[PDB]
Design a protein around this ligand. Structure first.
Ligand SMILES: [Mg+2]
Ligand SMILES: [Mg+2]
Ligand SMILES: [Mg+2]
Ligand SMILES: [Mg+2]
Ligand SMILES: [Mg+2]
Ligand SMILES: [Mg+2]
Ligand SMILES: [Mg+2]
Ligand SMILES: [Mg+2]
Ligand SMILES: [Mg+2]
Ligand SMILES: [Mg+2]
Ligand SMILES: [Mg+2]
Ligand SMILES: [Mg+2]
Ligand SMILES: [Mg+2]
Ligand SMILES: [Mg+2]
Ligand SMILES: [Mg+2]
Ligand SMILES: [Mg+2]
Ligand SMILES: [Mg+2]
Ligand SMILES: [Mg+2]
Ligand SMILES: [Mg+2]
Ligand SMILES: [Mg+2]
Ligand SMILES: [Mg+2]
Ligand SMILES: [Mg+2]
Ligand SMILES: [Mg+2]
Ligand SMILES: [Mg+2]
Ligand SMILES: [Mg+2]
Ligand SMILES: [Mg+2]
Ligand SMILES: [Mg+2]
Ligand SMILES: [Mg+2]
Ligand SMILES: [Mg+2]
Ligand SMILES: [Mg+2]
Ligand SMILES: [Mg+2]
Ligand SMILES: [Mg+2]
Ligand SMILES: [Mg+2]
Ligand SMILES: [Mg+2]
Ligand SMILES: [Mg+2]
Ligand SMILES: [Mg+2]
Ligand SMILES: [Mg+2]
Ligand SMILES: [Mg+2]
Ligand SMILES: [Mg+2]
Ligand SMILES: [Mg+2]
Ligand SMILES: [Mg+2]
Ligand SMILES: [Mg+2]
Ligand SMILES: [Mg+2]
Ligand SMILES: [Mg+2]
Ligand SMILES: [Mg+2]
Ligand SMILES: [Mg+2]
Ligand SMILES: [Mg+2]
Ligand SMILES: [Mg+2]
Ligand SMILES: [Mg+2]
Ligand SMILES: [Mg+2]
Ligand SMILES: [Mg+2]
Ligand SMILES: [Mg+2]
Ligand SMILES: [Mg+2]
Ligand SMILES: [Mg+2]
Ligand SMILES: [Mg+2]
Ligand SMILES: [Mg+2]
Ligand SMILES: [Mg+2]
Ligand SMILES: [Mg+2]
Ligand SMILES: [Mg+2]
Ligand SMILES: [Mg+2]
Ligand SMILES: [Mg+2]
Ligand SMILES: [Mg+2]
Ligand SMILES: [Mg+2]
Ligand SMILES: [Mg+2]
Ligand SMILES: [Zn+2]
Lengths: 206, 258, 60
RNA sequence: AAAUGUAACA
RNA sequence: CGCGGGGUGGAGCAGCCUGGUAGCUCGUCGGGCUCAUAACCCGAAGGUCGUCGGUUCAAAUCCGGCCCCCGCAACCA
RNA sequence: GGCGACACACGUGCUACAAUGCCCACUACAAAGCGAUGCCACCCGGCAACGGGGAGCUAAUCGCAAAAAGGUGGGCCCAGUUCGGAUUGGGGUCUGCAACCCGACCCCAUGAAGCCGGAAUCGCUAGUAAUCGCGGAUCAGCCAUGCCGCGGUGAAUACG
RNA sequence: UGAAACUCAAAGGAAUUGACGGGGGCCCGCACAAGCGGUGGAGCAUGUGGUUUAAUUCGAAGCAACGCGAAGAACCUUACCAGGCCUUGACAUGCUAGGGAACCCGGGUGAAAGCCUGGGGUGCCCCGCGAGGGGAGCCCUAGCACAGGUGCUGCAUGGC
RNA sequence: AGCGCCGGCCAACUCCGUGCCAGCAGCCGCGGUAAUACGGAGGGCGCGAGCGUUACCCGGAUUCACUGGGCGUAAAGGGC
């Protein structure tokens, strides 16, 4: 058990923080806690939409939450029905002016956290884990990625002996700083236990 | 709660001090290792009740433990309490003598017997002797032909006879005859005594040494299960690394109802 | 004894000594950083995600 | 010139 | 019953005769080496000298009595 | 109340057994950090811990802050000592609702082992080892001689 | 010359991939050597084995467990022990029925918790010059689902 | 309307109980707290006034080889 997290390894090189603001010693914690509660609520409510990234900004008493998603409509609703419903649920928790945006995920099959959650859904539906993994990688490469690697660990198929299955195509140079690699993790809860899913998408090097 | 009158069956050797010996079984030095684990457990239990546990013979294990270990536990109600340890205790654990790392089912055996120190019963009571003075046989002179001085004694209760015809006088021939008669009385009674030891231990230690009675001590799960009755607790360490009073007690409570 | 303890740690005590930091994320009582409100494990988990503003792997 | 390591691998 | 030899740490033996000092080997124990055991290395503990009496300033030692052990003898009719 | 027990056993460390040293006085030279019921200048009371006053600083401004080894001068004279600072008695300080079990610090007295360590064994190839101090996280306080950092001084040796 | 009883689910040939060799060749690493400073001995600090204990909570086990989880155990922490207590409960989502909501303040008993109580004014949209009639802002009491478990299995697992 | 069977050979799978126990077994093998292999149940497969078992004969066995085998190292060249 070794490998470093591929995003934290690229923070400020190929990947940018998800909470971009400044705060002083006396304040940092409380903003961060509220920041995570925003993600807590949104991660549950926006799952069906296709949540990929949740960016957060702060100035002074006002905060702007940018939600990236594959199905923008599922967030907005009918003419703004759910999008309005969100600000109220939001600024109730926030207690401040909570500006909520939405933005497209141009290619959900090039978004690693999306690929990961899809396979995790597939394996909670009792699908053939190995067939799924080869498929997921096949989608990501067809969508143009320079390389892809997907991993599933746990009681695969219900087996008592845990195992790890992975498949990969193209290049995935996890040692190269300048290589842009999206990473995502998805938890698959089954009747026999938890399976872990990891998705690596190599978009290109910068 | 109407306490059921348990004062109907009597018991002779129920409060007497008890010998306790633990012997290794199936599984090489692993069972020897466990025979010490059973002995410390009975040592924790004896000292927890202010009992005198005194070892008299031990055979060390090749890699630590006890192939055999016999001790004398003295106190009040010793045998009447530990007499349910006699039998085969089964083990299931990851050995300390393991190379790969797999569960191994070894076993040990425990013998528990009362005190009843052996008596002497000697000095040959004469009222059971029939002394026969006659004449000798072989070399000599007129003395042999005439002087008798050939002796044979007969112990009626055992049937053991001895005649001595070595030296001339019958009194020096009776002296040897008396001492030999008692030597045969004692060697014959000491036979009937140690025959009763190997005949009771054989039906208490269980010749089979892997699948027999008593308890099985599983360490991976944490299950001490005594198969005699029908109760499987989870103390294990608590019972082993310490005393185990509330385990013997459900066995005695069911044996009472029997 | 866990959720009751992450709860008793929130309520103000009978004497100000009895107050102690728990990790707001996982409830850990040990190795709690004041600056974040998080334990060393959560501090590492969120930092690798990038959900700690300005925090990055320090190398010199 | 120097001995040994039993007995329950998915 | 005679004669003469013995009993000294857990085991096997010294030390007595020319009295003051009980020692050797194994074992036991703590520490090392080794993945671990043995082997090996370092350090240590351990003896009412069979019991009862006495000669002596002083007894494992010398002198008596008892208790066990070993060997020999017990012939002439 | 216990996690702090104590016939014993092992690991990791701290301080040492001293003169290339110890003590006292005076005097230099860092870095990296931390700090608004926080860091505290300076003043006064106390041998002191500390206390009472009180300025500054949302800190390249103010503060922790003196770095220590070193340098200069004096004392010690080879001794279980002016080495060593364990153990215990007594008297206080601070934190805290509360220091019996079970806190750190100061002061008076006490002043143990230890004279360089068996079998065995660890680290390090250059600003390294060795040695010297400074900071931080945790944190009311602290059992930190621990950990993560920071600079000062600065070697030996590598045939193979 | 040459059986049988009995017993086993194999005994075997060659070749393949490893692993190992007190086989060989060629290399590398503070691995040895060359050096410098230590550990093992002392006193102490700390972790552990043991033993002790009502409890001395638990995990970590050769290198790669042992100043490791513990980057702060007097209460708290705390998972252990003793004793005093609470029963939809310290905490979530619920439906139902009674109080008044909500918040703040004391009294009694007690080691405290708790148990027992004496205080005080509820917005709303509402018939409201009127008793009076609510909804649901939140609490309180009774209930039923449920909560809660640092209880076991790292040999069912994810993550690290 | 009953009997055998439902791990592989070999056609027919799940729940519970059990927890190297009780037991199954023709071979290989099952059972140590998620057992399609033990016991029951539901369901399924195969036959049906029968269905299974034991025994014995030929077959599969080109495993006594005439059809139709072999002997350097697998059993097997006699010492010449
Ligand atoms: Mg024997
Ligand atoms: Mg004759
Ligand atoms: Mg005559
Ligand atoms: Mg006559
Ligand atoms: Mg509890
Ligand atoms: Mg939990
Ligand atoms: Mg605190
Ligand atoms: Mg804390
Ligand atoms: Mg001799
Ligand atoms: Mg002799
Ligand atoms: Mg020893
Ligand atoms: Mg005498
Ligand atoms: Mg003498
Ligand atoms: Mg003659
Ligand atoms: Mg306590
Ligand atoms: Mg502890
Ligand atoms: Mg203590
Ligand atoms: Mg030691
Ligand atoms: Mg040490
Ligand atoms: Mg230390
Ligand atoms: Mg001194
Ligand atoms: Mg002294
Ligand atoms: Mg000296
Ligand atoms: Mg050495
Ligand atoms: Mg030093
Ligand atoms: Mg602190
Ligand atoms: Mg202390
Ligand atoms: Mg420090
Ligand atoms: Mg071969
Ligand atoms: Mg080969
Ligand atoms: Mg080699
Ligand atoms: Mg080295
Ligand atoms: Mg190097
Ligand atoms: Mg060396
Ligand atoms: Mg040393
Ligand atoms: Mg030491
Ligand atoms: Mg433990
Ligand atoms: Mg545990
Ligand atoms: Mg522990
Ligand atoms: Mg280590
Ligand atoms: Mg406590
Ligand atoms: Mg408590
Ligand atoms: Mg484990
Ligand atoms: Mg594992
Ligand atoms: Mg894992
Ligand atoms: Mg059939
Ligand atoms: Mg199966
Ligand atoms: Mg068939
Ligand atoms: Mg089939
Ligand atoms: Mg059973
Ligand atoms: Mg199982
Ligand atoms: Mg089951
Ligand atoms: Mg079945
Ligand atoms: Mg079957
Ligand atoms: Mg018919
Ligand atoms: Mg038939
Ligand atoms: Mg046939
Ligand atoms: Mg034929
Ligand atoms: Mg032919
Ligand atoms: Mg053939
Ligand atoms: Mg041959
Ligand atoms: Mg051959
Ligand atoms: Mg020939
Ligand atoms: Mg021949
Ligand atoms: Zn945490």
């Amino acid at each position: 058990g070794n490998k470093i997290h591929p995003i934290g390894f690229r923070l400020g090189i190929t990947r940018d923080w998800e909470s971009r603001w400044y705060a002083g010693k006396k304040q940092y914690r409380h903003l961060l806690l509220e920041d995570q509660r925003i993600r807590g609520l949104l991660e549950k409510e926006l799952y069906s939409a296709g949540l990929a990234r949740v960016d957060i900004e702060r100035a002074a008493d006002n905060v702007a939450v940018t939600v990236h998603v594959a199905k923008p409509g599922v967030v907005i609703g009918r003419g703004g029905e759910r999008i309005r419903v969100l600000r109220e649920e939001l600024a109730k928790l926030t207690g401040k002016n909570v500006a909520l945006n939405v933005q497209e995920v141009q290619n959900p099959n090039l978004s690693a956290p999306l690929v990961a959650q899809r396979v995790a859904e597939q394996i909670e539906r009792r699908f053939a884990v190995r067939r799924a993994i080869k498929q997921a990688v096949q989608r990501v490469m067809e969508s143009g990625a320079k390389g892809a690697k997907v991993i599933v660990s746990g009681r695969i198929g219900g087996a008592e002996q845990a195992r790890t299955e992975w498949a990969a195509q193209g290049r995935v140079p996890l040692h190269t700083l300048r290589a842009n690699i999206d990473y995502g993790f998805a938890l698959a809860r089954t009747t026999y236990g938890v399976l872990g899913v990891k998705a690596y998408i190599f978009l290109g090097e910068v | 709660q109407q306490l059921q009158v348990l004062l109907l069956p009597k018991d002779p050797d129920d409060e007497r001090n008890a010998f306790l010996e633990v012997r290794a079984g199936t599984g090489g030095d692993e069972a020897a290792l466990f025979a010490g684990d059973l002995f410390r457990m009975y040592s924790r239990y004896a000292e927890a009740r202010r009992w005198r546990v005194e070892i008299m013979s031990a055979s060390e294990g090749e890699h630590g433990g006890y192939k055999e270990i016999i001790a004398k536990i003295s106190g009040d109600g010793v045998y009447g309490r530990l007499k349910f340890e006699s039998g085969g205790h089964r083990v299931q654990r990851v050995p300390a003598t393991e190379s790969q790392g797999r569960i191994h089912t070894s076993a040990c055996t425990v013998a528990v017997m009362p005190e009843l120190p052996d008596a002497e019963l000697p000095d040959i009571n004469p009222a059971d002797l029939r002394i026969d003075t006659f004449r000798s046989s072989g070399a000599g002179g007129q003395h042999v032909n005439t002087t008798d001085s050939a002796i044979r004694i007969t112990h009626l209760p055992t049937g053991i006879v001895v005649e001595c015809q070595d030296e001339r006088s019958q009194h020096k021939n009776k002296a040897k005859a008396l001492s030999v008669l008692g030597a045969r009385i004692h060697a014959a009674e000491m036979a009937k005594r140690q025959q009763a030891e190997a005949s009771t231990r054989r039906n208490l230690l269980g010749s089979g040494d892997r699948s027999d009675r008593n308890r099985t001590y599983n360490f991976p799960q944490g299950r001490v299960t005594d198969h005699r009755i029908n109760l499987t607790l989870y103390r294990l360490d608590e019972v082993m690394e310490g005393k185990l009073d509330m385990l013997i007690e459900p066995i005695i409570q069911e044996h009472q109802a029997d | 004894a866990r959720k009751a303890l992450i709860e008793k740690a929130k309520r103000t005590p009978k004497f100000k000594v009895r107050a102690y930091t728990r990790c707001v994320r996982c409830g850990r009582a040990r190795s709690v950083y004041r600056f974040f409100g998080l334990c060393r494990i959560c501090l590492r988990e969120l930092a690798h995600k990038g959900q700690l503003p300005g925090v990055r792997k320090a190398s010199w």
